[PDB]
């Protein structure tokens, strides 16, 4: 009953592979529904064509800024920012999907994919999903990041949507 969405990832326009995510709609329904709608684009805007603007190997891949493409933009289906829903789920290891924010109750559309267990983020960023298939593709994305987060090639979401 938990939805599954996919990202087809392209590197400088060349297809890399597909990542699918389980969204924990049972535990964080309002936040999950945000990510799901933005993945299908059914509200008229969302993630298709946007880039991963910050990739730090051994830490995380950050994306979701589809209005300014650099970490300063984005917006939710609920408006420009929505509340921290809960912190039931923790940052337990690689593959965790969590919301970026700018302080309490500032969730928009930016998210990150953890590539290591980030426990210091617990209680500060809302965890709402996990990589289901294609963790190897996230590992391949990592190799295009750097210590300061700048990517050496452009990593884009060429297509996305709902599988299940």
Swiss-Prot record:
Residues carrying N-acetylvaline: 1
Outcome of substituting residue 68 to A: No effect on peptidyl-prolyl cis-trans isomerase activity. Reduced interaction with BSG/CD147 and ability to induce leukocyte chemotaxis
One Pfam family linked to the record: Pro_isomerase
EC number: 5.2.1.8
Record PTM N6-acetyllysine, positions in chain: 27, 43, 75, 81, 124, 130, 132
Effect of residue 54 to A: Loss of peptidyl-prolyl cis-trans isomerase activity. No loss of its interaction with BSG/CD147 or its ability to induce leukocyte chemotaxis. No effect on its interaction with MAP3K5/ASK1
Outcome reported for the amino acid change (mutating residue 125 to A): Loss of peptidyl-prolyl cis-trans isomerase activity and interaction with HCV NS5A. Loss of ability to stimulate MAPK/ERK phosphorylation
Glycosylation, residue list: 107
Documented effect of changing residue 69 to A: No effect on peptidyl-prolyl cis-trans isomerase activity. Reduced interaction with BSG/CD147 and ability to induce leukocyte chemotaxis
Position of the Glycyl lysine isopeptide (Lys-Gly) (interchain with G-Cter in SUMO2) cross-link: 27, 81
Free-text function comment from the UniProt entry: Catalyzes the cis-trans isomerization of proline imidic peptide bonds in oligopeptides. Exerts a strong chemotactic effect on leukocytes partly through activation of one of its membrane receptors BSG/CD147, initiating a signaling cascade that culminates in MAPK/ERK activation. Activates endothelial cells (ECs) in a pro-inflammatory manner by stimulating activation of NF-kappa-B and ERK, JNK and p38 MAP-kinases and by inducing expression of adhesion molecules including SELE and VCAM1.
Family listed: Belongs to the cyclophilin-type PPIase family. PPIase A subfamily.
Protein name per its UniProtKB record: Peptidyl-prolyl cis-trans isomerase A
Source organism: Homo sapiens
Gene that produces this protein: PPIA
């Amino acid at each position: 009953v938990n939805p599954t969405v996919f990202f087809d990832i392209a590197v400088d326009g060349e297809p890399l592979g597909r990542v699918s995510f389980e969204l924990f709609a049972d535990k964080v329904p309002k936040t999950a529904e945000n990510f799901r709608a933005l993945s299908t684009g059914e509200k008229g805007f969302g993630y298709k064509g946007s880039c991963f603007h910050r990739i730090i190997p051994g830490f995380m891949c950050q994306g979701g800024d589809f209005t300014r493409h650099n970490g300063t933009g984005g917006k939710s289906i609920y408006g420009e920012k929505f509340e921290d829903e809960n912190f039931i789920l923790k940052h337990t290891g690689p593959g965790i999907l969590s919301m970026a924010n700018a302080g309490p109750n500032t969730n928009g559309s930016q998210f990150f994919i953890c590539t290591a267990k980030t426990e210091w983020l617990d209680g500060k960023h809302v965890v709402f999903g996990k990589v289901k298939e294609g963790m190897n593709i996230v590992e391949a994305m990592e190799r295009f990041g750097s210590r300061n987060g700048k990517t050496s090639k452009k990593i884009t979401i060429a297509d996305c949507g709902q599988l299940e």
